[PDB]
Design a protein around this ligand. Structure first.
Ligand code: HEM
Length: 280
């Protein structure tokens, strides 16, 4: 059983947009890396019903690229507003010990907000992947708009997972006006603008407790005029898709990279790719 493993995560608030064509870039495979685990999270509208009938393409295209690479799909879970998919190199799996499990948490009577958690064990180490979705107007267990619920947090289990990732649009925004935010973006003062981001506020309120975000060096990933690099300044530019990590058991999780994928411009938000190396 190996000393270390690699994990790629991508999330995208993709809205009504269909999965793209070039998936290699999306999953961070385009420079020949072969991560041990890949998780893909989306937030948007109408995945479950699938009225555009786009389900069949995703499967076809994702399964085509990933199977030839040695990946097994551990689980795809979709709701009306969220999607989470977890892949693992076939070579790591032992059916007797994997304990592959997913819960869905739902906070409203329309089941539009909440989250999804997918967990599995390899080499007697337990991974958990969460995505979540909250609306600004929602009444909530935290009485905030942030997409946290303690049920989705497997570091607050009696037996906390070894490696935990939370990916998606956490409904955390930049709390200042658009003029000032756009000035900071133009100056490339990413840390200056992050000073106004709400993740720290969420944490002062004991949400995402002990969860770390890798250092952010990219400009806000929202809100863009589609197919441009131009901010739509009807909203204050913000970091919407995020990746957070923790360990419940003192295991080292080292971010290698954390980047928006500005090549994917087809919508208002840009997908975010994180790569980690975890020590078992
Ligand atoms: C960038 C946007 C999207 C991404 C990245 C994405 C990603 C994924 C992934 C990774 C899977 C699992 C593929 C596999 O089987 O290995 C999946 C499945 C699926 N997607 Fe999406 N998706 C997107 C948009 C949508 C949209 C707009 C819809 C329709 C409302 C949709 C409907 C579905 C359905 C129905 C499945 C599962 C179908 C089945 O299991 O038979 N997706 N998607």
């Amino acid at each position: 059983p190996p000393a270390q493993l690699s994990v790629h995560t991508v999330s995208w608030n993709s809205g009504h947009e269909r999965a793209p064509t070039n998936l290699e870039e999306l999953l961070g495979l385009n420079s020949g890396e072969t991560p041990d685990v890949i998780a893909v999270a989306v937030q948007g509208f109408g995945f479950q019903t699938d009225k555009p009938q786009q389900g069949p393409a995703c499967v076809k295209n994702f399964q085509s690229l990933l199977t030839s690479k040695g990946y097994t799909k551990l689980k795809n879970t979709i709701t009306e507003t969220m999607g989470l998919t977890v892949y693992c190199l076939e070579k790591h799996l032992d059916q007797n010990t994997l304990k592959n499990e997913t819960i869905i948490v739902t906070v409203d009577d329309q089941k539009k907000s909440g989250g999804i958690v997918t967990s599995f064990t390899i080499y007697n180490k337990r991974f958990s992947f969460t995505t979540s979705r909250m609306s600004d107007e929602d009444v909530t267990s935290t009485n905030t708009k942030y997409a946290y619920d303690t049920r989705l947090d497997y570091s607050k289990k009696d037996d906390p997972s070894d490696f935990l990732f939370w990916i998606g649009d956490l409904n955390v925004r930049v709390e200042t006006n658009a003029t000032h935010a756009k000035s900071l973006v133009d100056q490339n003062n990413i840390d200056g603008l992050m000073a106004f981001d709400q993740l720290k506020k969420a944490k002062e309120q004991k949400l995402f407790d002990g969860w770390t975000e890798p250092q952010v060096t990219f400009k806000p990933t929202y809100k863009f005029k589609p197919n441009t690099d131009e901010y739509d300044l009807s909203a204050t530019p913000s970091w919407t898709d995020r990746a957070l990590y923790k360990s419940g058991t003192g295991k080292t999780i080292q971010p290698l990279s954390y980047n928006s994928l500005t090549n994917y411009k087809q919508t208002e938000h840009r997908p975010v790719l994180a790569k980690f190396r975890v020590t078992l």
